[PDB]
Design a protein around this ligand. Structure first.
Ligand SMILES: Nc1nc2c(ncn2[C@@H]2O[C@H](COP(=O)(O)OP(=O)(O)OP(=O)(O)O)[C@@H](O)[C@H]2O)c(=O)[nH]1
Ligand SMILES: Nc1ncnc2c1ncn2[C@@H]1O[C@H](COP(=O)(O)OP(=O)(O)CP(=O)(O)O)[C@@H](O)[C@H]1O
Ligand SMILES: Nc1nc2c(ncn2[C@@H]2O[C@H](COP(=O)(O)OP(=O)(O)O)[C@@H](O)[C@H]2O)c(=O)[nH]1
Ligand SMILES: CCOc1ccc(-c2cn(C)nc2-c2cc(OC)c(OC)c(OC)c2)cc1
Ligand SMILES: [Ca+2]
Ligand SMILES: [Ca+2]
Ligand SMILES: [Mg+2]
Ligand SMILES: [Mg+2]
Lengths: 53, 309, 424, 437
């Protein structure tokens, strides 16, 4: 069991111990935020058409 | 009034435990996909251990130990024996087995090949014990119930799955004398019923013929191997301090050689009981494994041995 | 989202509505003239849900009173808590609705509906953030049934993204004004399926049986039926009206209770049933609120399955023991809750109890058994409709037989739709 | 040093933020108004604690924090609370209308209107940074804001700030604490959309925290205050290395490197001991070996799973208090012989240790007792795949019937995003199983 890379300081210390070895764009986003607003606005239009009938 | 689910239809043991549970008044079965159970009697393949012990309010138990496949798959059982210290590579009761992937006689398995030419390759016990009158091979099946506390309970009644043909050294191809399973046979029940000899009779034969007992000559080594095997895997599988709990019924298959030495052939995680013993065993599983966790309104022998060294 | 606007339509609507305001004003320490004379800060902390604050720190209900005849709304003004309602919000016609849907929806009510919506707008405009609307009405008569469902359609047109609740007194021959009720109810149900997010089915059959059998009232008035309703109405609205931490709004309830949009017909329950000295243990409240005897919609919940449940325990009690008890009935009767919606029972606790009782429990269930109520009204409808009986009253107001055949069919689909998930 | 911005989305994030910053203040000796006597360089400095707080000429120490809820009631308690003066009001952002437990309402509808405001207020903090590292994002998996707005923000952060690290602190939903029925949808939908935009993600199952509070603090019915105060001690363990002088996990890139070799599998298990009651009259203080050994008990993990059945890719012990390297390695050797600590073949079978001598700080009058030494193990183990299996199974039950789906579609979302997002998770469960078996 080997205890390597030991580093010390006044507040603490650290080491490793080894037992054994071995994104879309601004356009694409703003697009399909607005595509969700289309279908939202289509449903509301369908309703207000149905309510007119 | 507790609740259970049955997700293994094929299990003849836990068909009977279901039947014994229902017929009481305090155990309603549910649909297999209901999450709100006290007891799962789960499937063999892909038992969803990750889903257990999460439903709030309910204490959840299951009839399998997760990771105990590492004792019942042959290929894993061989690796466990060669790799672990507690059962070392110098293990005096396991047949000398080897693994290469797909007296010098061997056997292969995971069609059964007994030869010198040619999964796991295992040393073949050339000179086994033979019952008289018969001149015939057998294997011993002992049923073992590990509960939620990891108490190892050995069922007193075992069974000798007998061969009925005389054994032969020169002839290997013929499977009716060498392989002593229940299905390969079906002289199917010439000497005893369905090729089975229960422990009272096998004790009497050893008393009369060999001037000893089953308890001393054979059962001491069975008790050693069972306890050796299960306590090795305990850290890997124990459900102590776990959000669900596990019991399991195991079936250990042994072979007694000519100089009264016991050998471990195979362990079975989903074992079928003998036709006579179902009622008494399955009752015992409800007593010890289920009712001990879920109380209502000894057939087993306990294998504990803390020798101080 | 804090403000709810309340509307009450017709005789039954205004009658149960009055009692709802009497009950909750008492729980908030608001006296008959509108002044606060309580004690706790918890009475005032969510008072803005149902009340506007006026000049001289008076609290006036956010309540609009609607009827096509002056009878009932005159009684409300004369009645005990009449002086609290804003007088501008009394909107009434004179000619009446004759227990006729057509009059309420198409002719007499059409004349008055715009003047009602002006007051609705007046109360909405001065809402910091309007969350939704609730309507008390009956489906058996003319005004509450016909005009009520018309106002619901108008309110949806103008406020299409707000929540629309109803407390809808479903009719029954045991407590019947007129033979035409099943017609009125069936025409209204079709409306409610489209234009409400939640509809609390108060069945008069149930309220009678509860008054008769389980309260020992031999000859029950409408007053005795309305006590049960105004208690239930206080119960479901507790978590909106009081704090807190686990606090609530209408939209989250509507979302979690309604798996499919047409299936939003709930089955209320209350415990214990009153008109007492021994307070109930938590296991009893749990047993009682889930009992068929305590249900306000006359359906046996064993004949279907719960899609969702919501339970509101009131009083100072062990929240450990509530959880334990709610988990008991779920784990002991799991066949009556759908497996395919996990964790479909939500419980809340509220420390303030109602007047009289030290601890109560209100129950809201979206069960598939509610189909039975619609099957009952669908049978009553067809007995008459198959002989076109009493249709002249409606066809005289311009209605067609086609409109009846539609509304029949829509409600028979609703019953099919509820039956679909009772088997799955 | 390099600066770090914490972002708290929804009720879960905000209220957990309050727990964290209250603790961070007590740890550094900063007070409710924001004055820090121990700070000598007034109005500036490049100390380790300045990675989380910024300074003003008046001597106030101000969090690098942004609170975001789509409804005001929760953030109002911050504005009127004990640490009201601590935050600049531009950091506390609110709407008028919540996402109603709906991923689509928070992401698509209400998200769209408020995203540009939030990113602007984040850029106000980024331009007080001489070299920004990245972001610590706090949210729920189950809320509409928490699930919905978070995924939109995490996308728009990768655009505007592409060279930075993004860490998640996620509250996996549990029936014991309050729950909506639709949270398994919200969780899967946001995990899918956030997966490529988060670098390391620390999940915390409320079921685990709840039971830890029941079992170890003897609290019958735990409040959020109880749950959050415990979660913040865990969070503080993890972030302390960024806030204090040290040599392990000194930047946000080092968490990724030490804990996340496979990038989709960026969900490490946090295990934390000891949790001890302040009401406990007589307490025998636990040693280095006892607390390290506790990091392999399931009962102390943030997510209930069985690390025995599954393999490790990375392990990190983060000690706090009276600890020395030789007591640690002694415990590590003991623990190797008793427990099934199976690593993957390609990774080394090791432990990156980090010690800070200042023992755990605790909130006055709180549930947790002061202790001489504590630890937080961070282990990228495949057993945490259990948490996905559970969530996906609930998802499959409701979605088989299209239950509640109309609510999401009604906010402009497409039903295809459900099956798309679930198919990613199906791939994620398969990515875990190859590595683990
Ligand atoms: N640990 C913890 N969990 C919380 C807290 N508040 C809410 N939750 C959990 O988060 C989920 C609900 O998410 P919330 O954060 O309340 O939702 P939100 O982000 O406000 O979303 P909307 O209210 O829909 O806008 C549930 O699983 C709750 O148990 C908290 O303070 N601490
Ligand atoms: N090394 C060996 N020496 C002698 N006989 C052996 C042997 N290995 C296997 N056998 C014999 O082969 C037969 C079947 O093999 P084995 O017991 O390994 O598999 P199995 O699957 O049939 C047992 P079960 O199904 O009950 O779990 C047994 O009857 C046994 O006697
Ligand atoms: N529960 C209850 N039901 C009522 C009351 N008044 C009328 N009803 C019922 O409502 C239906 C008649 O509706 P009603 O309100 O009189 O007609 P409207 O004034 O035109 O709406 C019948 O089914 C009655 O049984 C009441 O005070 N309480
Ligand atoms: C089937 C699950 O039903 C639920 C779950 C949760 C909620 C809910 C969420 N919030 C934020 N508030 C509520 C809620 C719960 C209630 O039941 C106790 C209410 O009483 C009826 C309530 O009043 C509006 C809100 C709802 C249903
Ligand atoms: Ca007229
Ligand atoms: Ca400084
Ligand atoms: Mg009348
Ligand atoms: Mg919110």
């Amino acid at each position: 069991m080997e205890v390597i890379e030991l580093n010390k300081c006044t507040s603490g210390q650290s080491f490793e111990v080894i037992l054994k070895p071995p994104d879309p764009s601004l356009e694409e986003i703003q697009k399909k935020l607005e595509a969700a607003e289309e279908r939202r606005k289509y449903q509301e239009a369908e309703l207000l058409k149905h309510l007119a009938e | 009034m507790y609740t259970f689910v049955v997700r293994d239809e094929n299990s003849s043991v836990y068909a009977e435990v279901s039947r014994l549970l229902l017929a009481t008044g305090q155990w309603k079965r549910l649909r297999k996909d209901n999450p709100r159970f006290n007891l799962m009697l789960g499937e063999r393949n892909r038992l969803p251990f990750g889903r257990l012990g999460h439903e709030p309010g309910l204490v959840q138990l299951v009839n399998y130990y997760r990771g105990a496949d590492k004792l019942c798959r042959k290929a894993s059982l061989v690796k466990l024996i060669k790799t672990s210290p507690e059962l070392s590579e110098s293990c005096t009761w396991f047949p000398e087995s080897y693994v290469i992937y797909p007296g010098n006689v061997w056997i292969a398995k995971s069609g059964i090949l007994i030869s010198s030419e040619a999964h796991v390759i295992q040393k073949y016990l050339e000179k086994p014990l033979l019952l008289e009158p018969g001149h015939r091979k057998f294997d011993i099946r002992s049923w073992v119930l590990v509960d939620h506390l990891y108490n190892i309970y050995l069922y007193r009644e075992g069974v000798l799955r007998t061969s009925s043909e005389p054994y032969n050294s020169a002839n290997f191809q013929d499977k009716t004398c060498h392989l002593t399973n229940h299905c390969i046979q079906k002289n199917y029940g010439r000497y005893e019923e369905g090729n089975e000899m229960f422990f009272e009779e096998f004790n009497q034969y050893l008393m009369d013929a060999l001037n000893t007992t089953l308890e001393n000559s054979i059962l001491l080594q069975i008790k050693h191997i069972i306890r050796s095997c299960l306590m090795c895997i305990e850290p890997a599988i124990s459900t102590k301090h776990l959000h669900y709990q596990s019991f399991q019924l195991f079936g250990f298959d042994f072979m007694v050689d000519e100089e009264l030495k016991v050998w471990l052939i195979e362990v079975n995680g989903a074992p079928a009981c003998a036709q006579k013993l179902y009622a008494e065993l399955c009752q015992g599983i409800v007593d010890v494994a289920i009712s001990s966790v879920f109380p209502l309104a000894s057939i087993f022998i306990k294998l504990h041995h803390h020798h101080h060294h | 989202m804090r403000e709810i606007v309340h509307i009450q339509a017709g005789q039954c609507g205004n009658q149960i509505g009055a009692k709802f305001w009497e009950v909750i004003s008492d729980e908030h320490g608001i006296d008959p003239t509108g002044s606060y004379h309580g004690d706790s800060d918890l009475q005032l902390e969510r008072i803005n849900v149902y009340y506007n604050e006026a000049t001289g720190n008076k609290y006036v209900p956010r309540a609009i009173l609607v009827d096509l005849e002056p009878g009932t709304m005159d009684s409300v003004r004369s009645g005990p808590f009449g002086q609290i309602f804003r007088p501008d919000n009394f909107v009434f016609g004179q000619s009446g609705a004759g227990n006729n849907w057509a009059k309420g929806h198409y002719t007499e009510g059409a004349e008055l509906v715009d003047s009602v919506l002006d007051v609705v707008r007046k109360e909405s405009e001065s809402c910091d953030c309007l969350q939704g609307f609730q309507l008390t009405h009956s489906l058996g008569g003319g005004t509450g049934s016909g005009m009520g469902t018309l106002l619901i359609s108008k309110i949806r047109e103008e406020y299409p993204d707000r929540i629309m609740n109803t407390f809808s007194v479903v009719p029954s021959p045991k407590v019947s004004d007129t033979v035409v009720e099943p017609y009125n109810a069936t025409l209204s149900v079709h409306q409610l399926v489209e234009n409400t997010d939640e509809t609390y089915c108060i069945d008069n059959e149930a309220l009678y049986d509860i008054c008769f059998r389980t309260l020992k009232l031999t000859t029950p008035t409408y007053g005795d039926l309305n006590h049960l309703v105004s208690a239930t109405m206080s119960g479901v609205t507790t978590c909106l009206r009081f704090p807190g931490q686990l606090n609530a709004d209408l939209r989250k309830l509507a979302v979690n209770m309604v798996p499919f949009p047409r299936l939003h017909f709930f089955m209320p329950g209350f415990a214990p049933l009153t008109s007492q000295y021994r307070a109930l243990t938590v296991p009893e409240l749990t047993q009682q609120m889930f009992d068929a005897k305590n249900m306000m919609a006359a359906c046996d919940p064993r004949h279907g399955r719960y899609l969702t449940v919501a339970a509101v325990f009131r009083g100072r009690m062990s929240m450990k023991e509530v959880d334990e008890q709610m988990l008991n009935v779920q784990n002991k009767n799991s066949s009556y809750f759908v497996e395919w919606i996990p964790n479909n029972v939500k419980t809340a606790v509220c420390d303030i109890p109602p007047r009289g009782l030290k601890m109560s429990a209100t129950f809201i269930g979206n069960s598939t058994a509610i189909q039975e109520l619609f099957k009952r009204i669908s049978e009553q409808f067809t007995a008459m409709f198959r002989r076109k009986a009493f249709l002249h009253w409606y066809t005289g107001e311009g209605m067609d037989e086609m409109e009846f055949t539609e509304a029949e069919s829509n409600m028979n689909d609703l019953v099919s739709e509820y039956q679909q998930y009772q088997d799955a | 040093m390099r600066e770090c911005i914490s972002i708290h989305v929804g009720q879960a994030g905000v209220q957990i933020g309050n727990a964290c910053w209250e603790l961070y203040c007590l740890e550094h000796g900063i007070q409710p108004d924001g004055q820090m006597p121990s700070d000598k360089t007034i109005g500036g400095g490049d100390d380790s604690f300045n990675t989380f707080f910024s300074e003003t000429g008046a001597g106030k120490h101000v969090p690098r924090a942004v609170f975001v809820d789509l409804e005001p009631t929760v953030i109002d308690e911050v504005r009127t609370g004990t640490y009201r003066q601590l935050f600049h009001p531009e950091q506390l952002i609110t709407g008028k209308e919540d996402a109603a437990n709906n991923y689509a309402r928070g992401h698509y509808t209400i998200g769209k209107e408020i995203i540009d405001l939030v990113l602007d207020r984040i850029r106000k903090l980024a331009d007080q940074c001489t070299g920004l590292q990245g972001f610590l994002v706090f949210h729920s998996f189950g809320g509409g804001t928490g699930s919905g707005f978070t995924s939109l923000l995490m996308e728009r952060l990768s655009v505007d700030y592409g060279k930075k690290s993004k860490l998640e602190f996620s509250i996996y939903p549990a029936p014991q604490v309050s729950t909506a029925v639709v949270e398994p949808y919200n969780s899967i939908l946001t995990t899918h959309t956030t997966l490529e935009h988060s670098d390391c993600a620390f999940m915390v199952d409320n079921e685990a925290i709840y039971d830890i509070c029941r079992r170890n603090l003897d609290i019958e019915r735990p409040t959020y205050t109880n749950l959050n105060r415990l979660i913040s001690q865990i969070v503080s363990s993890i972030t302390a290395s960024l806030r204090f002088d040290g040599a392990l996990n000194v930047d946000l890139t080092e968490f990724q490197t030490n804990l996340v070799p496979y990038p989709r599998i960026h969900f490490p298990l946090a295990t934390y001991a000891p949790v001890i009651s302040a009401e406990k009259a007589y307490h025998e203080q636990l040693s280095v070996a006892e607390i390290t050994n506790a990091c392999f008990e399931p009962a102390n993990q943030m997510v209930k799973c069985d690390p025995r059945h599954g393999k490790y890719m990375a392990c990190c012990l983060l000690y706090r208090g009276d600890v020395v390297p030789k007591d640690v390695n002694a415990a590590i050797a003991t623990i190797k012989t008793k427990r099934s600590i199976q690593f993957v073949d390609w990774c080394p079978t090791g432990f990156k240790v980090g010690i800070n001598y200042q023992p755990p700080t605790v909130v006055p009058g709180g549930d947790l007792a002061k202790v001489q030494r504590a630890v937080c193990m961070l282990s990228n183990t495949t057993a945490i795949a259990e948490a996905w299996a559970r969530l996906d199974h609930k998802f499959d039950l409701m979605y088989a019937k299209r239950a509640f789906v109309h609510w999401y579609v009604g906010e402009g979302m497409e039903e295809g995003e459900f099956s798309e997002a679930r198919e990613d998770m199906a791939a994620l469960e398969k990515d875990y199983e190859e590595v683990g078996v």
